[PDB]
Amino acid sequence: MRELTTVLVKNLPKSYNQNKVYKYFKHCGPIIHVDVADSLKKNFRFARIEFARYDGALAAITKTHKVVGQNEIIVSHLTECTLWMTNFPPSYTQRNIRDLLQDINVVALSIRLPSLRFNTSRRFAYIDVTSKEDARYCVEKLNGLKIEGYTLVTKVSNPLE
Protein backbone atom coordinates (compact mmCIF):
# COMPACT_ATOMS: atom_id res chain seq x y z
CA MET A 1 0.00 0.00 0.00
CA ARG A 2 1.92 3.00 -1.54
CA GLU A 3 2.22 3.26 -5.34
CA LEU A 4 1.93 6.33 -7.62
CA THR A 5 0.37 4.75 -10.75
CA THR A 6 -1.37 7.97 -11.77
CA VAL A 7 0.16 11.27 -12.93
CA LEU A 8 -1.08 14.82 -13.38
CA VAL A 9 0.15 17.47 -15.83
CA LYS A 10 -0.05 21.26 -15.24
CA ASN A 11 0.40 24.48 -17.30
CA LEU A 12 -0.87 23.01 -20.62
CA PRO A 13 -0.52 25.70 -23.34
CA LYS A 14 -2.49 25.78 -26.59
CA SER A 15 0.72 24.13 -27.90
CA TYR A 16 -0.05 20.98 -25.76
CA ASN A 17 -3.75 20.47 -26.71
CA GLN A 18 -5.22 16.92 -26.33
CA ASN A 19 -4.00 15.83 -29.82
CA LYS A 20 -0.44 16.90 -28.96
CA VAL A 21 -0.59 15.37 -25.44
CA TYR A 22 -1.83 12.09 -26.95
CA LYS A 23 1.37 11.92 -29.11
CA TYR A 24 3.46 12.26 -25.93
CA PHE A 25 1.68 9.85 -23.49
CA LYS A 26 1.62 6.92 -26.00
CA HIS A 27 5.39 7.52 -26.56
CA CYS A 28 5.90 7.45 -22.74
CA GLY A 29 4.42 4.03 -21.80
CA PRO A 30 1.36 1.75 -21.80
CA ILE A 31 -1.71 3.50 -20.25
CA ILE A 32 -5.26 2.58 -19.14
CA HIS A 33 -6.85 6.10 -19.25
CA VAL A 34 -5.95 9.71 -20.19
CA ASP A 35 -7.87 13.07 -20.08
CA VAL A 36 -7.22 16.86 -20.02
CA ALA A 37 -8.77 19.54 -17.82
CA ASP A 38 -9.84 22.75 -19.44
CA SER A 39 -10.13 24.95 -16.32
CA LEU A 40 -11.55 28.09 -17.99
CA LYS A 41 -11.72 29.87 -14.59
CA LYS A 42 -7.84 29.89 -14.49
CA ASN A 43 -5.07 30.68 -16.97
CA PHE A 44 -3.19 27.37 -16.63
CA ARG A 45 -4.76 24.04 -17.69
CA PHE A 46 -4.22 20.57 -16.15
CA ALA A 47 -4.49 16.92 -17.34
CA ARG A 48 -4.60 13.44 -15.72
CA ILE A 49 -3.28 10.00 -16.85
CA GLU A 50 -3.85 6.52 -15.35
CA PHE A 51 -0.75 4.68 -16.58
CA ALA A 52 -1.62 2.04 -13.90
CA ARG A 53 2.19 1.41 -13.47
CA TYR A 54 5.10 2.86 -11.51
CA ASP A 55 7.46 2.72 -14.55
CA GLY A 56 4.55 4.41 -16.38
CA ALA A 57 4.66 7.34 -13.92
CA LEU A 58 8.47 7.73 -14.28
CA ALA A 59 8.20 7.77 -18.10
CA ALA A 60 5.67 10.63 -17.74
CA ILE A 61 7.48 12.63 -14.97
CA THR A 62 10.81 12.48 -16.90
CA LYS A 63 9.05 13.77 -20.07
CA THR A 64 8.32 17.12 -18.33
CA HIS A 65 11.70 18.68 -19.33
CA LYS A 66 10.63 19.79 -22.84
CA VAL A 67 9.15 23.31 -23.11
CA VAL A 68 6.25 23.73 -25.57
CA GLY A 69 5.57 27.22 -26.98
CA GLN A 70 6.56 29.51 -24.08
CA ASN A 71 4.73 27.40 -21.43
CA GLU A 72 6.91 24.72 -19.85
CA ILE A 73 4.46 21.92 -18.80
CA ILE A 74 4.83 20.22 -15.38
CA VAL A 75 4.36 16.41 -15.02
CA SER A 76 4.24 14.81 -11.58
CA HIS A 77 2.32 12.15 -9.61
CA LEU A 78 -1.40 12.74 -8.91
CA THR A 79 -2.46 14.55 -5.67
CA GLU A 80 -5.29 13.54 -3.26
CA CYS A 81 -7.78 15.92 -5.05
CA THR A 82 -9.65 12.92 -6.55
CA LEU A 83 -13.04 12.27 -5.03
CA TRP A 84 -14.25 8.70 -5.51
CA MET A 85 -17.62 7.13 -4.67
CA THR A 86 -17.90 3.48 -3.56
CA ASN A 87 -21.24 2.64 -1.90
CA PHE A 88 -23.13 4.40 -4.78
CA PRO A 89 -25.72 3.07 -7.33
CA PRO A 90 -24.89 2.75 -11.10
CA SER A 91 -27.55 5.41 -11.96
CA TYR A 92 -24.81 8.03 -11.29
CA THR A 93 -24.32 8.75 -15.01
CA GLN A 94 -21.22 10.80 -16.04
CA ARG A 95 -23.48 13.79 -16.97
CA ASN A 96 -25.05 13.67 -13.47
CA ILE A 97 -21.63 14.11 -11.89
CA ARG A 98 -20.86 17.21 -14.03
CA ASP A 99 -24.15 18.68 -12.75
CA LEU A 100 -23.46 17.68 -9.10
CA LEU A 101 -19.90 19.10 -9.08
CA GLN A 102 -21.24 22.37 -10.54
CA ASP A 103 -23.94 22.35 -7.83
CA ILE A 104 -21.45 22.00 -4.90
CA ASN A 105 -18.20 23.41 -6.38
CA VAL A 106 -18.61 25.08 -9.82
CA VAL A 107 -15.54 23.60 -11.56
CA ALA A 108 -14.05 20.10 -11.99
CA LEU A 109 -10.86 18.74 -13.46
CA SER A 110 -12.06 15.32 -14.80
CA ILE A 111 -14.76 12.54 -14.38
CA ARG A 112 -14.23 8.69 -14.70
CA LEU A 113 -17.01 6.06 -14.49
CA PRO A 114 -16.31 2.31 -14.16
CA SER A 115 -16.79 -0.06 -17.12
CA LEU A 116 -16.43 -3.67 -15.88
CA ARG A 117 -18.91 -5.76 -17.80
CA PHE A 118 -22.09 -3.89 -18.85
CA ASN A 119 -23.30 -1.60 -16.01
CA THR A 120 -24.46 -3.91 -13.19
CA SER A 121 -20.88 -4.30 -11.82
CA ARG A 122 -21.13 -2.37 -8.45
CA ARG A 123 -17.55 -1.03 -8.93
CA PHE A 124 -16.41 2.45 -7.76
CA ALA A 125 -16.12 5.85 -9.62
CA TYR A 126 -13.38 8.52 -9.61
CA ILE A 127 -13.59 12.31 -10.24
CA ASP A 128 -10.85 14.99 -9.97
CA VAL A 129 -11.41 18.62 -8.91
CA THR A 130 -9.18 21.72 -8.49
CA SER A 131 -11.87 22.70 -5.87
CA LYS A 132 -10.26 20.58 -3.09
CA GLU A 133 -10.63 23.15 -0.29
CA ASP A 134 -14.46 22.96 -0.50
CA ALA A 135 -14.14 19.23 -1.39
CA ARG A 136 -12.93 18.62 2.23
CA TYR A 137 -16.37 19.88 3.38
CA CYS A 138 -18.33 18.00 0.64
CA VAL A 139 -16.69 14.66 1.61
CA GLU A 140 -17.79 14.99 5.19
CA LYS A 141 -21.44 15.60 4.09
CA LEU A 142 -21.51 12.80 1.47
CA ASN A 143 -19.66 10.22 3.68
CA GLY A 144 -22.97 9.98 5.61
CA LEU A 145 -25.61 11.04 3.05
CA LYS A 146 -28.66 8.68 2.96
CA ILE A 147 -30.19 7.41 -0.32
CA GLU A 148 -32.79 4.57 -0.21
CA GLY A 149 -31.46 3.65 3.28
CA TYR A 150 -27.88 3.21 2.00
CA THR A 151 -25.33 5.47 3.59
CA LEU A 152 -23.33 6.84 0.66
CA VAL A 153 -19.57 6.77 0.97
CA THR A 154 -17.17 8.96 -0.94
CA LYS A 155 -13.54 9.94 -0.18
CA VAL A 156 -11.24 12.77 -1.49
CA SER A 157 -7.87 10.94 -1.64
CA ASN A 158 -6.01 8.54 -4.00
CA PRO A 159 -7.21 4.87 -3.49
CA LEU A 160 -3.87 3.10 -4.27
CA GLU A 161 -1.17 5.30 -2.66
Side-chain angles (χ1 to χ4, degrees):
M1 191 296 190
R2 65 113 200 176
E3 247 199 57
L4 300 167
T5 49
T6 352
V7 291
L8 98 79
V9 196
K10 341 185 200 196
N11 244 24
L12 257 58
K14 71 184 187 299
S15 315
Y16 210 80
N17 248 66
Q18 274 174 18
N19 213 42
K20 268 126 283 193
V21 324
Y22 193 109
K23 308 264 286 109
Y24 271 62
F25 92 120
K26 69 78 114 276
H27 286 314
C28 297
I31 292 100
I32 298 192
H33 183 62
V34 68
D35 194 17
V36 312
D38 46 336
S39 39
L40 83 89
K41 296 290 182 179
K42 296 289 172 68
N43 170 35
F44 312 104
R45 264 116 173 281
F46 305 97
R48 59 78 154 280
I49 319 199
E50 178 172 303
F51 280 74
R53 273 169 193 194
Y54 76 77
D55 161 73
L58 270 300
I61 297 157
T62 51
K63 224 63 46 180
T64 207
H65 308 284
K66 274 108 190 231
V67 181
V68 45
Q70 304 171 290
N71 209 50
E72 67 85 22
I73 61 89
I74 308 120
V75 190
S76 331
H77 70 84
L78 182 59
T79 173
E80 65 264 33
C81 302
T82 299
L83 34 146
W84 54 279
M85 288 207 101
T86 172
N87 280 194
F88 85 127
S91 205
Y92 265 59
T93 36
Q94 211 254 19
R95 51 176 77 182
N96 207 238
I97 307 166
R98 197 250 288 177
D99 262 332
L100 256 284
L101 67 84
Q102 187 142 94
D103 182 64
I104 194 131
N105 288 120
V106 62
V107 65
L109 197 149
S110 285
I111 317 175
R112 261 256 86 166
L113 256 70
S115 297
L116 232 302
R117 265 283 172 93
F118 300 104
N119 62 73
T120 332
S121 328
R122 220 170 192 173
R123 214 235 202 179
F124 315 141
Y126 322 85
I127 303 100
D128 288 5
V129 304
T130 172
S131 324
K132 58 144 270 185
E133 287 209 326
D134 286 298
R136 294 155 86 175
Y137 162 88
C138 181
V139 56
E140 211 281 282
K141 242 269 191 274
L142 258 59
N143 244 131
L145 165 66
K146 273 83 164 178
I147 297 292
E148 306 197 297
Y150 238 75
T151 16
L152 266 305
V153 181
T154 321
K155 202 94 299 182
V156 186
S157 74
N158 193 25
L160 41 294
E161 113 186 52

